[PDB]
Amino acid sequence: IKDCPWYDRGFCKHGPLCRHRHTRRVICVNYLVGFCPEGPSCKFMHPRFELPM
Amino acid sequence: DKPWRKPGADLSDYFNYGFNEDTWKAYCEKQKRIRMGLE
Amino acid sequence: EDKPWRKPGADLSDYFNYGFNEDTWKAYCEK
Ligand SMILES: [Zn+2]
Ligand SMILES: [Zn+2]
């Protein structure tokens, strides 16, 4: 099992029927604004927008 | 289809980070606006 | 460093959203 990369980007059209896990996360305000100096170690998520296939 | 609208639907099964269908669409337009001007 | 994203091997997108980099972030802020 893996975290659903669609849910991690922010929207998974399959909802509860997804085979992947839908891990609820909290977005990093600074990354949402455009830049966060904490990187990988940020306590909050940095969601990518690239679509998985 | 929009099965996340249907009554009794848990929006959070579909949307992460506290997004809804309206805030998700705005965030998609923000991605597009900011990215177009970058290298 | 003061600036861990510059370090060899670091992924810029762990720090910068929207495909920003140090140069284009500075310019965007200082507009
Ligand atoms: Zn999913
Ligand atoms: Zn952060």
PDB file of C-alpha atoms and ligand atoms in Angstrom:
ATOM      1  CA  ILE A   1       0.000   0.000   0.000  1.00  0.00           C
ATOM      2  CA  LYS A   2       1.177   3.565  -0.623  1.00  0.00           C
ATOM      3  CA  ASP A   3      -0.216   6.982   0.172  1.00  0.00           C
ATOM      4  CA  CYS A   4      -2.390   8.061  -2.776  1.00  0.00           C
ATOM      5  CA  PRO A   5      -0.341  10.593  -4.813  1.00  0.00           C
ATOM      6  CA  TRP A   6      -3.628  12.200  -6.054  1.00  0.00           C
ATOM      7  CA  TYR A   7      -4.854  12.742  -2.451  1.00  0.00           C
ATOM      8  CA  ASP A   8      -1.327  14.056  -1.519  1.00  0.00           C
ATOM      9  CA  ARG A   9      -1.610  16.654  -4.385  1.00  0.00           C
ATOM     10  CA  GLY A  10      -5.009  17.475  -2.760  1.00  0.00           C
ATOM     11  CA  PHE A  11      -7.868  15.838  -4.692  1.00  0.00           C
ATOM     12  CA  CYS A  12      -8.592  12.070  -5.330  1.00  0.00           C
ATOM     13  CA  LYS A  13     -11.753  11.571  -7.473  1.00  0.00           C
ATOM     14  CA  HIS A  14     -12.064   7.950  -6.077  1.00  0.00           C
ATOM     15  CA  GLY A  15     -12.553   9.088  -2.447  1.00  0.00           C
ATOM     16  CA  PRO A  16     -13.230   6.145  -0.091  1.00  0.00           C
ATOM     17  CA  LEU A  17     -13.006   3.597  -2.968  1.00  0.00           C
ATOM     18  CA  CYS A  18      -9.317   4.480  -3.636  1.00  0.00           C
ATOM     19  CA  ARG A  19      -6.956   1.412  -3.335  1.00  0.00           C
ATOM     20  CA  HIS A  20      -4.269   3.846  -2.025  1.00  0.00           C
ATOM     21  CA  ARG A  21      -4.405   5.391   1.513  1.00  0.00           C
ATOM     22  CA  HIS A  22      -5.855   8.973   1.843  1.00  0.00           C
ATOM     23  CA  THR A  23      -3.513  10.332   4.587  1.00  0.00           C
ATOM     24  CA  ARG A  24      -5.042  13.580   5.969  1.00  0.00           C
ATOM     25  CA  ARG A  25      -2.360  16.274   6.097  1.00  0.00           C
ATOM     26  CA  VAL A  26      -2.036  19.952   7.032  1.00  0.00           C
ATOM     27  CA  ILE A  27      -0.488  22.252   4.433  1.00  0.00           C
ATOM     28  CA  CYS A  28       2.502  24.523   5.301  1.00  0.00           C
ATOM     29  CA  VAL A  29       1.305  28.171   5.013  1.00  0.00           C
ATOM     30  CA  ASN A  30       4.831  29.225   3.927  1.00  0.00           C
ATOM     31  CA  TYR A  31       5.066  26.641   1.109  1.00  0.00           C
ATOM     32  CA  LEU A  32       1.521  27.671   0.023  1.00  0.00           C
ATOM     33  CA  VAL A  33       2.789  31.317  -0.156  1.00  0.00           C
ATOM     34  CA  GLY A  34       5.806  30.063  -2.173  1.00  0.00           C
ATOM     35  CA  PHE A  35       8.810  29.430   0.060  1.00  0.00           C
ATOM     36  CA  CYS A  36       9.503  27.497   3.300  1.00  0.00           C
ATOM     37  CA  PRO A  37      13.063  27.338   4.746  1.00  0.00           C
ATOM     38  CA  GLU A  38      12.359  24.108   6.736  1.00  0.00           C
ATOM     39  CA  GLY A  39      12.285  21.784   3.662  1.00  0.00           C
ATOM     40  CA  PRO A  40      11.961  17.989   4.263  1.00  0.00           C
ATOM     41  CA  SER A  41      11.926  18.427   8.055  1.00  0.00           C
ATOM     42  CA  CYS A  42       9.014  20.911   7.848  1.00  0.00           C
ATOM     43  CA  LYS A  43       6.343  19.752  10.334  1.00  0.00           C
ATOM     44  CA  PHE A  44       3.700  20.623   7.646  1.00  0.00           C
ATOM     45  CA  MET A  45       3.139  19.206   4.161  1.00  0.00           C
ATOM     46  CA  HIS A  46       4.628  20.740   0.934  1.00  0.00           C
ATOM     47  CA  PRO A  47       2.165  19.431  -1.690  1.00  0.00           C
ATOM     48  CA  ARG A  48       3.435  19.022  -5.269  1.00  0.00           C
ATOM     49  CA  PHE A  49       1.124  19.842  -8.177  1.00  0.00           C
ATOM     50  CA  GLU A  50       2.622  17.437 -10.837  1.00  0.00           C
ATOM     51  CA  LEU A  51      -0.070  14.863 -11.762  1.00  0.00           C
ATOM     52  CA  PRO A  52       0.670  11.186 -11.173  1.00  0.00           C
ATOM     53  CA  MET A  53      -0.243   8.889 -14.146  1.00  0.00           C
TER      54      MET A  53
ATOM     55  CA  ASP B   1     -19.620  12.596 -12.122  1.00  0.00           C
ATOM     56  CA  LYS B   2     -19.251  14.464  -8.747  1.00  0.00           C
ATOM     57  CA  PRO B   3     -19.837  11.650  -6.188  1.00  0.00           C
ATOM     58  CA  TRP B   4     -18.415  13.924  -3.384  1.00  0.00           C
ATOM     59  CA  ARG B   5     -21.556  16.179  -3.651  1.00  0.00           C
ATOM     60  CA  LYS B   6     -24.107  13.293  -3.091  1.00  0.00           C
ATOM     61  CA  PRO B   7     -25.693  13.586   0.420  1.00  0.00           C
ATOM     62  CA  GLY B   8     -23.841  11.748   3.261  1.00  0.00           C
ATOM     63  CA  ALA B   9     -20.499  12.061   1.313  1.00  0.00           C
ATOM     64  CA  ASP B  10     -17.382  12.773   3.443  1.00  0.00           C
ATOM     65  CA  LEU B  11     -15.632  15.656   1.561  1.00  0.00           C
ATOM     66  CA  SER B  12     -12.287  14.797   3.258  1.00  0.00           C
ATOM     67  CA  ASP B  13     -12.324  11.334   1.499  1.00  0.00           C
ATOM     68  CA  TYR B  14     -11.837  13.325  -1.756  1.00  0.00           C
ATOM     69  CA  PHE B  15     -10.087  16.567  -0.696  1.00  0.00           C
ATOM     70  CA  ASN B  16      -6.928  16.861   1.438  1.00  0.00           C
ATOM     71  CA  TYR B  17      -5.702  19.828   3.534  1.00  0.00           C
ATOM     72  CA  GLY B  18      -9.265  21.072   4.283  1.00  0.00           C
ATOM     73  CA  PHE B  19      -9.907  21.980   0.602  1.00  0.00           C
ATOM     74  CA  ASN B  20     -13.451  21.911  -0.836  1.00  0.00           C
ATOM     75  CA  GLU B  21     -14.500  21.896  -4.509  1.00  0.00           C
ATOM     76  CA  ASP B  22     -14.455  25.767  -4.530  1.00  0.00           C
ATOM     77  CA  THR B  23     -11.052  26.302  -2.710  1.00  0.00           C
ATOM     78  CA  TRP B  24      -9.501  23.433  -4.780  1.00  0.00           C
ATOM     79  CA  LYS B  25     -10.479  25.176  -8.069  1.00  0.00           C
ATOM     80  CA  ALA B  26      -9.031  28.523  -6.773  1.00  0.00           C
ATOM     81  CA  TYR B  27      -5.782  26.745  -5.813  1.00  0.00           C
ATOM     82  CA  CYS B  28      -5.620  25.203  -9.347  1.00  0.00           C
ATOM     83  CA  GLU B  29      -5.942  28.792 -10.881  1.00  0.00           C
ATOM     84  CA  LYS B  30      -3.228  30.122  -8.447  1.00  0.00           C
ATOM     85  CA  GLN B  31      -0.840  27.316  -9.580  1.00  0.00           C
ATOM     86  CA  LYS B  32      -1.450  28.399 -13.196  1.00  0.00           C
ATOM     87  CA  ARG B  33      -1.053  32.159 -12.569  1.00  0.00           C
ATOM     88  CA  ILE B  34       2.222  31.921 -10.530  1.00  0.00           C
ATOM     89  CA  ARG B  35       3.864  29.167 -12.701  1.00  0.00           C
ATOM     90  CA  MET B  36       3.426  30.897 -16.073  1.00  0.00           C
ATOM     91  CA  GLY B  37       5.960  33.652 -15.145  1.00  0.00           C
ATOM     92  CA  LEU B  38       8.808  31.301 -13.893  1.00  0.00           C
ATOM     93  CA  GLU B  39      11.909  29.598 -15.509  1.00  0.00           C
TER      94      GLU B  39
ATOM     95  CA  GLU C   1      24.431  26.680   5.863  1.00  0.00           C
ATOM     96  CA  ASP C   2      22.007  29.564   6.512  1.00  0.00           C
ATOM     97  CA  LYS C   3      20.613  28.168   3.188  1.00  0.00           C
ATOM     98  CA  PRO C   4      20.234  24.346   3.125  1.00  0.00           C
ATOM     99  CA  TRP C   5      18.568  24.309  -0.376  1.00  0.00           C
ATOM    100  CA  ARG C   6      21.873  25.529  -2.008  1.00  0.00           C
ATOM    101  CA  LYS C   7      23.825  22.476  -0.597  1.00  0.00           C
ATOM    102  CA  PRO C   8      24.772  19.869  -3.300  1.00  0.00           C
ATOM    103  CA  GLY C   9      22.011  17.252  -3.838  1.00  0.00           C
ATOM    104  CA  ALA C  10      19.211  19.310  -2.134  1.00  0.00           C
ATOM    105  CA  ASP C  11      15.860  19.366  -4.054  1.00  0.00           C
ATOM    106  CA  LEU C  12      14.831  23.056  -4.580  1.00  0.00           C
ATOM    107  CA  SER C  13      11.108  22.015  -4.545  1.00  0.00           C
ATOM    108  CA  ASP C  14      11.375  20.950  -0.857  1.00  0.00           C
ATOM    109  CA  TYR C  15      11.749  24.744  -0.146  1.00  0.00           C
ATOM    110  CA  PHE C  16      10.322  26.555  -3.187  1.00  0.00           C
ATOM    111  CA  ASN C  17       6.751  26.013  -4.443  1.00  0.00           C
ATOM    112  CA  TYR C  18       5.453  26.728  -8.015  1.00  0.00           C
ATOM    113  CA  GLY C  19       8.925  26.102  -9.605  1.00  0.00           C
ATOM    114  CA  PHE C  20      10.393  29.208  -7.839  1.00  0.00           C
ATOM    115  CA  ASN C  21      14.172  29.356  -7.281  1.00  0.00           C
ATOM    116  CA  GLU C  22      16.274  31.736  -5.145  1.00  0.00           C
ATOM    117  CA  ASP C  23      16.527  34.254  -8.022  1.00  0.00           C
ATOM    118  CA  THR C  24      12.837  34.284  -9.137  1.00  0.00           C
ATOM    119  CA  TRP C  25      11.498  34.213  -5.509  1.00  0.00           C
ATOM    120  CA  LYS C  26      13.610  37.327  -4.672  1.00  0.00           C
ATOM    121  CA  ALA C  27      12.305  39.111  -7.802  1.00  0.00           C
ATOM    122  CA  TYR C  28       8.644  38.096  -7.038  1.00  0.00           C
ATOM    123  CA  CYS C  29       8.916  39.413  -3.403  1.00  0.00           C
ATOM    124  CA  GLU C  30      10.821  42.628  -4.363  1.00  0.00           C
ATOM    125  CA  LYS C  31       8.314  43.618  -7.126  1.00  0.00           C
TER     126      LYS C  31
HETATM  127 ZN    ZN D   1      -6.751   8.128  -3.959  1.00  0.00          ZN
HETATM  128 ZN    ZN D   2       7.059  24.205   5.404  1.00  0.00          ZN
END
